[PDB]
Write a protein that holds these residues in place. Structure first.
Motif, short mmCIF file in Angstrom:
data_model
loop_
_atom_site.label_atom_id
_atom_site.label_comp_id
_atom_site.label_asym_id
_atom_site.label_seq_id
_atom_site.Cartn_x
_atom_site.Cartn_y
_atom_site.Cartn_z
N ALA A 1 0.82 -1.21 0.00
CA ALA A 1 0.00 0.00 0.00
C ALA A 1 0.86 1.26 0.00
O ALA A 1 0.62 2.18 -0.79
N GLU A 2 1.86 1.32 0.88
CA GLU A 2 2.72 2.49 0.93
C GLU A 2 3.42 2.71 -0.41
O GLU A 2 3.32 3.79 -1.01
N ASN A 3 4.11 1.68 -0.91
CA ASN A 3 4.79 1.79 -2.19
C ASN A 3 3.81 1.93 -3.34
O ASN A 3 4.12 2.61 -4.33
N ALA A 4 2.63 1.32 -3.24
CA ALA A 4 1.64 1.47 -4.30
C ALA A 4 1.21 2.92 -4.44
O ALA A 4 1.18 3.46 -5.55
N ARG A 5 0.88 3.58 -3.33
CA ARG A 5 0.50 4.99 -3.38
C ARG A 5 1.68 5.86 -3.81
O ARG A 5 1.51 6.80 -4.60
N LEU A 6 2.88 5.56 -3.31
CA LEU A 6 4.05 6.33 -3.70
C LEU A 6 4.26 6.27 -5.21
O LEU A 6 4.51 7.29 -5.85
N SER A 7 4.15 5.08 -5.79
CA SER A 7 4.22 4.97 -7.24
C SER A 7 3.10 5.75 -7.90
O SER A 7 3.35 6.63 -8.73
N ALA A 8 1.85 5.49 -7.48
CA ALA A 8 0.70 6.11 -8.13
C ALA A 8 0.86 7.62 -8.23
O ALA A 8 0.46 8.22 -9.23
N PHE A 9 1.43 8.24 -7.20
CA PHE A 9 1.58 9.69 -7.23
C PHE A 9 2.87 10.12 -7.91
O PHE A 9 2.83 10.89 -8.88
#
Lengths: 521, 528, 517, 41
Positions: free
Chosen positions: C12-20
């Motif tokens: 989740a943390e890395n997923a959001r970091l990528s998404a943004f």
């Protein structure tokens, strides 16, 4: 002061591009002038190439950096437009890149650098055009003198009195006066073994590089002739797919032979009916160009036959003759043929060259094909190179009439004038103009260094002399010092310097405008 | 067998590993719960990117090696048909139950007792829901229809079709009415065909009272439409399964013509067979010939000459739909075809949707029928997929509402009421039952907290306020701000969930929790 | 292990970091190319034999591969700009990247789901679009020449169509149906009446709104000072499906009585209508005799079978609304219509609406010989109107040089004050994202971006200011005096596309790894 | 919605201290009552 932190640094890309371009420019710089040092490049095939020509060095360097290839592009553009000075444009580009790097170290944005360089280049071009000594294309004497000056650098010098007027007339026959840019590529240099240097001809029409049929039936000439370009060959049925001849009786063999002969005769008759009196067969190794029976049929039909023609000759004749190629005999008609008063093979002292004259066709143009003769291959090669150089010089004169003094005199004068004028400017523009003026002195510095002269002293001598003269004193290798280049007959077309300045400006603008590199596949 | 590369857990880490795996699986779609749940990016192995918050879709496309996660996903796949729109809620409730069971086990409670207590708590919660349920159909038919349309609109509004979702809701209601009777109050989804294609707009949706049969009529010269013939008795359909060709060998064939005698014999045989078939068709009086197989060139020519449009390669289910819509029968062969078995339909014509130039063939009745087809179109594939999913959800919701008059309200109000009832009952039952009831109530509390979190509200304060409102003042339907609302008390906001739907959600969550808990040993071999 | 084939969901943390972050990084590929003074970018191939340099944002985005799924999604969403406008893709990408960066900063300051951020961005985008519409200017002077051009275009389009029977008449009708609207040119504002009994050359023009399928059994043929409200109620054929239901009755009479009671139960809703001050009632479905009598007793006109398209068009022309229930009296929006007349055209009943409140619509009556002629005429009229509508989309321009963008940012900032505190931050973030564009434009021009941006902001904030960025002199100049303007359509499309792209990624929690190609 | 940024990370130190205190408490717990287990140090 303080600047943006720039965690990501696009300026690194620009720094790398500038470093690579300046390295290439410095490598090419040492070859400037007649005294330039030779460069050795070993190809991947093991061949060793030694030459001081900037074009060949750049081509063999196999530059891999995409931005550094802008120098090769600039050299190609200079060759297409000017035909000489490929080293000077690269040196100017390197000097401008160094000036841009220095400006960036002062905190000047690249876009302002590009704009100010463009303005300075415009002003320098104006100044150069102001001092140019105009000439007229209708005055054969000036063009002959320029051609002789250009040819003096070649081994063939005592015969320049004939080579110069030859090129002058060849160019004038197609350029006349007030024709703006004229492309010299339409002029063909045909080499033939035999004769001497003095043996040459222009032929206002077009000249073929192949001889007529020397076997029986070859007319060797024909008046009131129409010339067409044939891509097919006259041979019995030769399907491109699987095929064979099946015979089950003597009558079948006779029928097959009669059919083949009838096909050859029909092809020849179709060629004749189109009124094509000159047959130009493209060279082929799969089908006989003109069968012996086909040759006899054409001879009976009064058709001139020329075979063993390469693709380059066909491409040249496509413009020289004004006709169109014929894909196959089925499409062979009169509309695809040219015209000419007479086509014949000329053999004065073993020349044996087929020429076409009196085309009188709207599509056809007077593509003068200069004939080069010489007993030795070296003679004809040197004559071709010298004539190419003369044609380039004459083209430079035609596009922009007039010549300027060589030896870096115009560079020094322009640098001095720009430095004086920039004092009236304000802001970053004044600094950039001063840097451009300082960089302009690279060419004379390189010439002095390559000539074995004191680098700093030569520039000072030129600057001091320019205070009294104007575009008269420059560096000459003949005197091993600074002398009156104009009185020494050391003259160069103004177009060369103008194109060099323009190309250097465009190249520096393009290099500075690249701010990032990314991969695309 | 295949001992190498074999892993197992039992006795020490089995329960903890299973519960952690279940929690990890739940967290995949936990944030997607509710109408405003965050979307997830699903990418096919070919690189096609899709965006959706549907928990069922997210879990169905997810493959993994974990045994507990695989079992949970497989159970959710089967539950998707039972409820459809409750997959995420059931998964979250099961995950919360497993989380509570973790603590219960840490306290020394055997898994069987935990499962029994959870079952009893589910029974009590269902009883409380039944006690607190309200009847809409027993109050007013107009209100019942209004609530059906409102549920359909709510389901549709979460997608792009919200601009003109009214048409989809009306079509869904009409399809349910046509296909479902009140004797069983069950919608036969097998008789409600879902079909669509990329193109057109959301306003091109149409409800068809019969099969589509978008066929090219085989022969190019074959007429593409069957007209009613200016007021005639509709269109008579020949329902056939035998191919319109004579018997042929299966080994060599190559029935070529070498002389006059063979030509005459072969032509006699083939023409006799074709003439027999065409004469049978004509005697039957059918206007359109429908066969389960293709047609021969001679058959096509004869049909064209007799003005008998042909339909080729109609599937068995399509034949059943034809029979149901047209009140016809399937005739095995041409020789068995008669006017007494032909079906009747209003017309067979080409219908254009939006800018579509295909001119698909549709069989229309214009009357009430037991089988209908829901046609869905849209400017993009995503629009069509979302519209189909919303239509399926609306159909399921309408079926649930009609089946049982008792309904509950969404937004977690039912969950809060069940949690309060379970907490109250927990103190009355002694032993492990008290712990089980408390755990079940805490697990029920998860759903409203998750919904509040997805809506940007604080789950702690929101849940406390909901409990205070539903306990101190009175029992009502107060939930979280799932959508933009003026205030709480969904009762006035008309957010209604079927009672049967909630009961099925609770039962399925309990069953999944029992299935995961009852496995105390997992063995997995290697891979080749 | 989850999913497979190198396509797995990231933490989740890395997923959001990528998404943004990855989505924002797409802008950096085209940020330097924003504006006419943008920089050049080098794209190098693996073989290095096909490398090229270009400054086109669309080419850069479509040529450079993007491994991060977030970048793929952002580019795919921004691609709509090319089809809608065909230019400004760089601006769309830059604005989307700035919005995503601001949203990421907000999340880092809140660590809460961006749904509130999405709502704030929606509100800020609406305010900015309203401000841009207010700041637009009209270059359609000399409307007579535009009318002549429309007539010529209509005549050109009517060629080879059934409408060619009276080319001049149909060209005039088509031109009028677009010009006299004085607003939206969508086909929904233009009604086509298809009737038989005449020639297409006899088509009549009616500025009023006309419907078919007249209503009522005992209703009057004329309604004056109508107060119109539309509702979706089943006032006819209640209890549609009852087959299979067991009724605890002795005979069908009691079942009929139960159905009558169910129908009567709607009397409460019927009476609630009168409490709104309504004298005209429109229902999507049919109305039975009993509800019709109930409405008559209340003095309310009953309109039946209004369907959906008719309801939508009637509400649009009268400015009404459609509801399903009446929760509270006196709380609704009512339309107005001065006169409603019952007329028959071509032996077919029709309803004529005149005096609609701010009504902006036109009607064309077609008199054909058969169905084919009427359908062809309708399609030709639709095509001609669509072609003619182009004139109402061009000539709309806004002040260039960031003046319009700065005005929109000021409007968003104003909106940031009349809003709850939990959304003022999002509104301010949207305003900052809007303001980022002139900063990047100044940076690409090689001037001091901060000074120019601050001066432009101060000038625009300080009242009726038309100043903008002078990328040629590196100062602030009056755009209106210099005639520096930019297409209103381009700016509106760019802003809408950027807002949509930001919304698409904001609602995403986790992103699954893209499959390498 | 918008809440405190919480840029710092005091939670790490707080949780470490809580873990240490809970470990000590668990160590001391088993001695409660008359039947408490004896501890040897």
């Amino acid at each position: 002061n303080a600047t943006f932190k720039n965690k990501e640094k696009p300026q690194e890309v620009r720094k790398a591009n500038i470093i690579a371009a300046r390295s290439v420019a410095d490598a090419i710089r040492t070859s400037l002038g007649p005294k330039g040092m030779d460069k050795m490049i070993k190809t991947s095939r093991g061949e060793i190439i030694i030459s001081n020509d900037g074009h060949t060095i750049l081509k063999q360097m196999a530059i891999l950096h995409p931005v550094a290839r802008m120098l090769v592009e600039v050299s190609a553009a200079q060759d297409s437009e000017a035909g000489d000075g490929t080293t000077s444009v690269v040196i100017l580009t390197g000097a401008l890149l160094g000036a841009a790097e220095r400006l960036l170290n002062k905190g000047i944005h690249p876009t302002i650098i590009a704009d100010s360089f463009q303005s300075a280049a415009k002003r320098s071009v104006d100044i150069l055009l102001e001092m140019c000594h105009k000439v007229s294309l209708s005055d054969r004497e000036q063009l002959v003198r320029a051609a002789s000056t250009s040819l003096s650098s070649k081994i063939v010098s005592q015969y320049s009195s004939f080579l110069a007027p030859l090129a002058v007339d060849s160019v004038l026959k197609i350029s006349d006066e007030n024709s703006k840019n004229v492309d010299l590529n339409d002029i063909r240099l045909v080499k033939k073994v035999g004769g001497t240097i003095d043996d040459t001809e222009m032929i206002d029409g077009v000249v073929l590089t192949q001889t007529a049929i020397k076997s029986a039936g070859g007319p060797t000439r024909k008046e009131k002739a129409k010339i067409g370009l044939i891509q097919f060959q006259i041979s019995p049925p030769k399907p491109d797919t699987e095929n064979n001849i099946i015979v089950n009786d003597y009558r079948q063999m006779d029928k097959i032979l009669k059919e083949e002969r009838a096909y050859l005769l029909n092809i020849c008759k179709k060629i004749k009916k189109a009124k094509c009196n000159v047959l130009l067969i493209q060279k082929s190794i799969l089908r006989d160009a003109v069968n012996d029976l086909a040759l006899h049929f054409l001879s009976k039909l009064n058709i001139m036959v020329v075979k063993d023609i390469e693709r380059e000759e066909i491409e040249f004749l496509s413009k020289g003759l004004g006709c169109k190629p014929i894909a196959d005999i089925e499409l062979f008609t009169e509309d695809r043929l040219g015209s000419a008063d007479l086509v014949e093979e000329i053999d004065s002292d073993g020349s044996k060259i087929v020429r076409v004259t009196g085309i009188r066709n709207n599509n056809a143009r007077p593509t003068v094909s200069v004939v080069i003769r010489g007993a030795n291959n070296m003679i004809i090669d040197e004559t071709e190179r010298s004539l190419h150089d003369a044609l380039c010089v004459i083209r430079c004169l035609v596009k922009e009439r007039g010549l300027i003094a060589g030896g870096g005199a115009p560079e020094i004068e322009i640098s001095r004038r720009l430095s004086k004028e920039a004092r009236s400017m304000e802001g970053v523009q004044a600094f950039i103009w001063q840097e451009f003026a300082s960089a302009l002195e690279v060419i004379p510095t390189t010439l002095a260094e390559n000539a074995g002269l004191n680098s700093i002293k030569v520039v000072t001598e030129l600057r001091s002399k320019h205070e009294n003269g104007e575009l008269n004193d420059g560096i000459s290798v003949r005197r091993s010092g600074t002398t009156n280049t104009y009185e020494e007959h050391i003259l160069q077309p103004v177009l060369v310097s103008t194109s060099a300045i323009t190309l250097a400006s465009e190249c520096v603008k393009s290099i500075l405008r690249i701010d990032d590199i990314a991969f695309s596949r | 067998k295949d001992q190498g590369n074999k892993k197992r857990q039992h006795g020490l880490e089995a329960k903890k590993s299973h519960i952690l795996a279940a929690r990890s699986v739940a967290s995949i779609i936990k944030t997607s719960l509710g109408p405003r749940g965050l979307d997830k990016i699903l990418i096919s192995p070919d690189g096609e990117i899709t965006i959706t918050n549907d928990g069922a879709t997210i879990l169905s496309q997810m493959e993994l090696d974990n045994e507990i996660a695989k079992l949970l996903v497989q159970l959710s796949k089967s539950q998707d048909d039972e409820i459809g729109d409750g997959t995420t809620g059931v998964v979250v409730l099961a995950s919360a139950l497993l989380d509570q069971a973790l603590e219960l086990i840490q306290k020394g409670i055997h898994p069987i007792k935990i499962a029994n207590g959870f079952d009893e708590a589910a029974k009590l919660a269902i009883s409380k829901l039944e006690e607190t349920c309200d009847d809409i159909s027993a109050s007013n038919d107009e209100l019942f229809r209004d609530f059906l349309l409102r549920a359909a609109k709510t389901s549709l509004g979460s997608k792009i079709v919200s601009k003109d979702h009214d048409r989809f809701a009306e079509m869904a209601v009409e399809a349910v009415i046509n296909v479902m009777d009140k004797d069983r109050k069950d919608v036969d989804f097998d008789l409600i065909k879902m079909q669509g294609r990329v193109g057109g707009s959301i306003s091109d949706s149409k409800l068809i009272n019969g099969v589509i049969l978008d066929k090219d009529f085989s022969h190019p010269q074959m007429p593409k439409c069957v007209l009613p013939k200016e007021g005639s008795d509709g269109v008579k359909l020949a329902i056939l399964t035998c191919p319109f060709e004579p018997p042929k060998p299966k080994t060599k064939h190559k029935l070529d013509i070498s002389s006059v005698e063979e030509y005459q014999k072969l032509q006699t045989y083939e023409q006799d067979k074709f003439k027999e078939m065409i004469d049978d068709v004509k005697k039957a009086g059918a206007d359109v010939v429908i066969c389960q197989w293709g047609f021969d060139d001679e058959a096509n020519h004869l049909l064209l000459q007799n003005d008998l449009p042909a339909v080729r390669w109609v599937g068995g289910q399509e034949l059943e739909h034809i029979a149901i819509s047209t009140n016809g029968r399937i005739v095995p062969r041409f020789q068995d075809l008669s006017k007494d078995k032909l079906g009747t339909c209003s017309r067979i014509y080409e219908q254009e949707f939006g800018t579509t130039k295909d001119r698909m063939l549709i069989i229309e009745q214009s009357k009430e029928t037991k089988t209908v087809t829901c046609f869905v179109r849209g400017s993009n594939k995503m629009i069509v997929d979302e519209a189909e999913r919303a239509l399926h959800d609306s159909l399921c919701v309408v079926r649930n509402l009609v089946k049982d008059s008792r309904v509950v309200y969404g937004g977690g109000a039912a969950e809060v009421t069940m949690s309060l009832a379970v907490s109250e009952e927990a103190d009355k039952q002694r032993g492990i039952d008290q712990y089980a009831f408390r755990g079940f109530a805490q697990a029920l509390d998860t759903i409203p907290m998750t919904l509040a979190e997805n809506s940007g509200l604080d789950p702690i304060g929101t849940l406390s306020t909901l409990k205070s409102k539903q306990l101190k003042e009175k029992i009502s339907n107060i939930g979280v701000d799932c959508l933009g609302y003026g205030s709480n008390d969904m009762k006035e906001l008309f957010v209604v969930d079927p009672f049967i739907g909630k009961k099925q959600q609770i039962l399925l969550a309990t069953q999944l929790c029992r299935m995961i808990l009852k496995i105390d040993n997992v063995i997995i071999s290697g891979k080749d | 292990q989850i999913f497979g084939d190198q396509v797995t969901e990231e933490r989740a943390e890395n997923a959001r970091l990528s998404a943004f972050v990855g989505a924002i990084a797409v802008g950096d590929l085209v940020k330097s190319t924003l504006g006419p003074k943008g920089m050049d970018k080098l794209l190098q191939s693996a073989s290095s034999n096909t490398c090229m340099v270009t400054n086109d944002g669309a080419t850069i985005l479509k040529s450079i591969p993007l491994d991060n799924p977030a970048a793929k999604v952002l580019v795919n969403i921004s691609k709509v700009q090319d089809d809608e406008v065909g230019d400004g893709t760089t601006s769309v990408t830059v604005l989307s990247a700035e919005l995503l960066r601001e949203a990421e900063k907000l999340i880092d300051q809140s660590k809460i789901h961006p749904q509130t951020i999405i709502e704030g961005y929606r509100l800020a985008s609406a305010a900015a679009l309203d401000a841009l519409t207010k700041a637009a200017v009209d270059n359609s002077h000399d409307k007579t020449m535009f009318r002549e051009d429309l007539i010529h275009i209509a005549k050109t389009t009517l060629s080879s169509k059934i409408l060619s029977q009276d080319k001049d008449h149909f060209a005039e009708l088509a031109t009028n149906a677009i010009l006299r609207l004085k607003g939206s040119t969508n086909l929904e504002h233009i009604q086509i009446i298809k009737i038989l009994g005449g020639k297409l050359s006899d088509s009549f023009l009616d500025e009023g709104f006309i419907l078919a399928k007249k209503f009522g059994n005992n209703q009057p043929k004329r309604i004056e000072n109508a107060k119109i409200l539309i509702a979706n109620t089943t006032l006819d054929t209640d209890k549609v499906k009852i087959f299979g239901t067991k009724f605890k009755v002795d005979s069908t009479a009691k079942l009929a009585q139960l159905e009558k009671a169910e129908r009567e139960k709607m009397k409460n809703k019927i009476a609630k209508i009168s409490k709104f001050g309504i004298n005209t009632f429109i229902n999507r479905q049919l109305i039975y005799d009993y509800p019709e009598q109930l409405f008559t007793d209340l003095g309310i006109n009953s309109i039946e079978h209004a369907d959906f398209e008719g309801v939508e068009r009637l509400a649009l022309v009268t400015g009404g609304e459609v509801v399903s229930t009446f929760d509270e009296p006196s709380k609704c929006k009512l339309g107005e219509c001065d006169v409603i007349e019952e007329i028959m055209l071509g032996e077919q009943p029709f309803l004529k609406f005149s005096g609609c409140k701010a009504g902006e619509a036109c009607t064309i009556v077609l008199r054909g010989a058969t169905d084919q002629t009427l359908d062809e005429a309708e399609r030709s009229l639709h095509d001609a109107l669509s072609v003619l509508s182009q004139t109402t989309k061009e000539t709309r321009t806004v002040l260039g040089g960031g003046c319009a963008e700065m005005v929109m940012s000021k409007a968003v900032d104003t909106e940031a004050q009349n809003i709850d505190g939990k959304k003022s931050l999002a509104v301010e973030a949207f305003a900052r994202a809007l303001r980022q564009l002139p900063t990047i434009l100044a940076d690409n021009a090689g001037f001091d971006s901060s000074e120019l941006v601050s001066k432009l902001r101060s000038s625009i904030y300080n009242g009726i200011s038309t100043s903008g960025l002078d990328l040629n002199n590196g100062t602030i100049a009056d755009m209106r005096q210099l005639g520096i303007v930019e297409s209103y359509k381009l700016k509106r499309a760019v802003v809408s596309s950027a807002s949509e792209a930001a919304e698409v990624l904001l609602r995403v929690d986790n992103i699954i790894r893209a499959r390498p190609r």
